[PDB]
Amino acid sequence: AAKDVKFGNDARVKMLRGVNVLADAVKVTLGPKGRNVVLDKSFGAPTITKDGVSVAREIELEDKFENMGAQMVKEVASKANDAAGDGTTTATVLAQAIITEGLKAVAAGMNPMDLKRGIDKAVTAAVEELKALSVPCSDSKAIAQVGTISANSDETVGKLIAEAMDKVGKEGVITVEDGTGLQDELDVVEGMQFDRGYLSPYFINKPETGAVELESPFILLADKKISNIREMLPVLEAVAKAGKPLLIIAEDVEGEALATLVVNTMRGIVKVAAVKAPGFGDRRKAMLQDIATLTGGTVISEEIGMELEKATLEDLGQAKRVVINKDTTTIIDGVGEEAAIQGRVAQIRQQIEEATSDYDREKLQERVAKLAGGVAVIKVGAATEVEMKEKKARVEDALHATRAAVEEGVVAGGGVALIRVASKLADLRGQNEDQNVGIKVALRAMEAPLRQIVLNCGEEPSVVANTVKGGDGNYGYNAATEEYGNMIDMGILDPTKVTRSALQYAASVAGLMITTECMVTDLPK
Template identity: 65%
Template sequence: KVIESIQSRARKVTGRDEIAQVGNISANGDREVGDMIAEAMEKVGNEGVITVEEAKGLHTELDVVEGMQFDRGYLSPYFVTNPEKMVADLDNPYVLLFDKKVSSLQPMLPLLEAIVQSGKPLLIIAEDVEGEALATLVVNKLRGGLKIAAVKAPGFGDRRKAMLEDIAVLTGGQVVSEDLGIKLETVTLDMLGTAKSITITKEETTIVDGAGEKAQIEARVAQIRAQIEETTSDYDREKLQERLAKLAGGVAVIKIGGASEVEVKERKDRVDDALHATRAAVEEGIVAGGGTALLYSVRALEGLEGENHDQTIGVDIVRRALQAPVRQIAQNAGVDGAVVAGKLLEQDDVEFGYDAQKGEYTNLVKAGIIDPAKVVRTALQDAASVAGLLITTECMIADKPEDKSSGGGAPDMGGMGGMGGMGGMGF
């Protein structure tokens, strides 16, 4: 009943401002972080990949990559076309996708001759390009007869085959695979993919504006979405999500800067938390923050009694636990938590709450104090799960408390961190 109450009050995130507000709250009031996450989601879409990295400078910046990017660079520096930036830029290239190693160019000679006549560059994406074949490609590139580059296919095993298929759909080509009865000797120009441009660095390859048909790309996206729903592995889900983003959205990188390593790491952790909270808000919507979403759910338990005395006590425990976050936030702000909780429960407006920062009662949603409904829901469910486990467990292993002699230092401020364990309060 409590979960249903929370979900019934959740409303969809409607714009960039609300996304920024969620990020701002989750990053401990860092407005720059909220705005940057909102901008990243706006540019790459809700399903786009947003990663957080440590920058080398003082400033935090957002870098958005258009098109599909994968972490494989050129196999030889001789493929570079821009020595100053050490990148290989290919304009309107053909893309050959091969799921095995290329050890000899002999089977490819008819194809290479056709490409030379077309005047277009060629990118070979294969499991590997070995010694003699790689040396021959480099020699032809240096002589100016063939504009070419080669990279290893991304991923490993079955995932590599799937990613090659993704690139094939994106570029409008076919994967040359002997499993499908296609050999290198029989490949023609119309079996190759194409793109507006491809940029290859030492570490990554970016394909921009592939020539694949929109309907086929959408079908591939739908297929990957279905796999995400079915998989039970978190790792597989993450990798599928990355593939989906590369096809459907894009890739954004938030690079965290700072004056020291400690500052950068602390800020990176905050941005990670804010990013997860923002994704949760987009997924299941938002509710009023400040612990009020749980507090007002107490009303869903009115008149509810268990089938026996123990169950009735259990309902009372949940009822008290739902008030704990609001009480703790108020106490952390130096206010009587019981008074705040009591005053809020007298209200009919479920968006009304206590702004601990300003020390006033207000409409929390309008004030930008909001929580992702998914975070509130999972916090409650996980707390109930752990509490239930402890109740049914005969013994528990815990650290032995140490006897600390009370010194003359500052008083213990342990209570200020109460929000970290709010889920289990009252159990």
């Protein structure tokens, strides 16, 4: 209903109170000596975590403006999460430091737009300096090292990631499964990966993972919008007769087709997971034909003539397994013939040969890459189902860190990346006093994660910060042993992509976050 607004310094201090609450809540967990944070579960024991994702996602404040600031910083933490997969505590610490120094500077009357431009130029310089400082992880040994370090210093997980990385190549597809035998089962089978997520969060069978894992599902391929559920009615009847999971690939799913599928999954007699159509236009139709070749299915289009009502069990594609991530879907061991897939690979290869547009040629090249390379599967091997699930989670976040390192690079972890970047950029000036002050805000705020790691270890943050700044190169302060040394020697490493994205999104929300005056809200009632 009616609303209260708050503009001026009271708005910023309400917001700052909120962001300080959330950022301290998550920054208690930062670092390997990160302290445990307890969180309510409605039933049973309260969960306890050193992971800032779980803490941050749980936060919402009682005051609507503190709530507002908390929701902003939590959303940018989640954005940096979805970009990389880790480092939300780092992103929130950076966002808190930048926003506290920035609002303190703005309360000194400096121009908020000029201060934001100063942070913008300083963070662009930090990004390019981090790219210059980025050490590639293209070699397999450092891939094994980062896979070990990410997964609780377990050499087997990083090793398996290394062989799978070799099998599917530099940009290939690696997926984790649960293996029965105590030996790890590494295999390569021809499959699919595309960047399309689910239509609703209610389609996820496992909320603890965030993906829809279906074993032996029937796959429908559609190039048209699902306007009504009567088109899905014979398919639902057929899959209810079959009693197997169902995957839907369509151009658009309307809000009421989605609503009926959500009601059906709450009924759950059918196991329906729907994704958007990957690609665009003729490219989308062509790679949907590729998927139909992979799974033995058929693409249904309004323009060609067939309808979703006229669907049989033979017409739908099938595979041994599918996974539907938050924004990604992969298909493992499609039923469709490898000879037909090879023929499709050849056809898109002459399409590459006749291609003149560079972007279309790149689309066809990635089409033949995903159609020929396939998917590697690492099946977790050990004795217990308990260590199945924990080692599976370790494989998941380890391969996330591995692909993040492979995409961009690796830099010495433990905050010394941003410390060295700051020590390389103290000479950068701005177009006036206020942009220069914003540069200095960014400089004193990229030093925050190392200070917070040290503070979690209990040592003096300023002493260790000056100790790391005095040293040159990759010298820093190991927190697990609480001793100084080289990160590369002791293996403490972070992907360049996750740190760069964390700093980028922290600076982006900080520029959008300083320059906020009017805060409208639902009335406190």
